[PDB]
């Protein structure tokens, strides 16, 4: 009872961008007020949390091209 | 009772952009008021949370091209 | 009792954009008031939550082209 | 009862950007007020948390191209 | 042709307040965005102006009692 | 042709306050963004101006009692 598995995925893919000019961008946030109140906080096993945050981002990647590629080969007898 | 598996996916795909100019962008948020009240917080096993957030983003990727590709091959006897 | 499986998907696909100019964009949010009240919060097994959020985004991808492609091959005896 | 597994994934992929000029970017956040109140905090097993944060980022990668690629081959008798 | 003018105003007035306790007052303004644009400004003869102002006041006078009293006696031949 | 003018104003007035306690006052302004643009400014003869101001006041006079009293006697032949 033989098993013969072949996993030969080819990728010639291209995630690509072209942008002559990129700019003249303005991010003028006008300020705020946050309040949080808690008795008890508890967390476990791979929690990711933000509490009471006021936060501003400007992200201008000339690039910005992302590619995500996950091979899983699983074998059980 | 032989098993013969062949997984030969080809991809020649192209996710692509072209943009002569990109700009003159303005993000002027006008500010706010947030309030949250809690007795007890509890979290476990891979929670992702935001509480009481006031938050501004400007994301101008000249690129912006994303590609997500997941091969799973599973075998059980 | 032989099994012979062949998985040879070809993709020559193209997700594509062309845009001469892109701009003169204005995002002027005028501010707000949020209030949330809770006795007890509990969460488990891969919850994703936002509570009491006031939040502004400007996303101008010159690119913006996304492609999502999932191969699953499953085998059980 | 022989097992013969071959995992020969090829990738010739290219995540790529081209951007003639990139600039004239302005990030003028206007300041805020955050308040958080807690009796008891408890955390365990790989928590990641932010409490009471006011925080501004400007991220202008000329590059910005990211690629994430995960091979898992698992074998159980 | 005699003129005899008598101006004998009496005031025994009392502007008065009584307040046992005064307090527990909260003024949490949530922030804003103002913009003004002008070519030419010109002003003369006792102008009072405010342009492009964002401004917060808290005025808790335990007292607060005001009295304004103007005697004018004018004579022309 | 005689003129006889008498100006004998009496004031026994009292502007008065009484306040047992005064306090527990909080002024938490949340921050802002002001912008003003001008080619030419010109001012003369007793102008009072504010341009582009962001400004916070807390004024807690235990007293606060004001009185303003203007006698003018004018004579022309």
Author numbering:
A (entry chain A), B (entry chain E), C (entry chain F), D (entry chain B), E (entry chain D), F (entry chain C): 304 to 380
What do the study's own words say?
Dominantly inherited mutations in MAPT, the microtubule-associated protein tau gene, give rise to cases of FTD and parkinsonism linked to chromosome 17. Here, we used cryo-electron microscopy to determine the structures of tau filaments from the brains of human MAPT mutants V337M and R406W. Both amino acid substitutions gave rise to tau filaments with the Alzheimer fold, which consisted of paired helical filaments in all V337M and R406W cases and of straight filaments in two V337M cases. V337 lies inside the ordered core of the Alzheimer fold, whereas R406 lies outside it.
We used two previously unreported cases with the MAPT mutation encoding R406W, case 1 from a US family (temporal cortex, parietal cortex and hippocampus) and case 2 from a UK family (frontal cortex, temporal cortex, parietal cortex and hippocampus). We determined the cryo-EM structures of tau filaments from the temporal cortex, parietal cortex and hippocampus of case 1 and from the frontal, temporal and parietal cortices of case 2. PHFs were present in all samples but we did not observe SFs or TFs. The structures of PHFs were determined to resolutions of 3.0–4.2 Å and found to be identical to those of AD PHFs. The ordered core of the R406W tau protofilament extended from G273/G304 to E380. The r.m.s.d. between Cα atoms of the two structures was 0.78 Å. According to MS of the sarkosyl-insoluble fractions, we detected only mutant W406 peptides, except in the parietal cortex from case 2, where R406 and W406 peptides were found. Immunoblotting of sarkosyl-insoluble tau revealed strong bands of 60, 64 and 68 kDa, as well as a weaker band of 72 kDa, consistent with the presence of all six tau isoforms in a hyperphosphorylated state. There were also astrocytic tau inclusions in the cases with substitution R406W, suggesting that both nerve cell and glial cell inclusions contained the Alzheimer fold. In addition to filaments with the Alzheimer and CTE folds, we also observed TMEM106B filaments in the sarkosyl-insoluble fractions from brain regions of both individuals, who died aged 78 and 66, respectively.
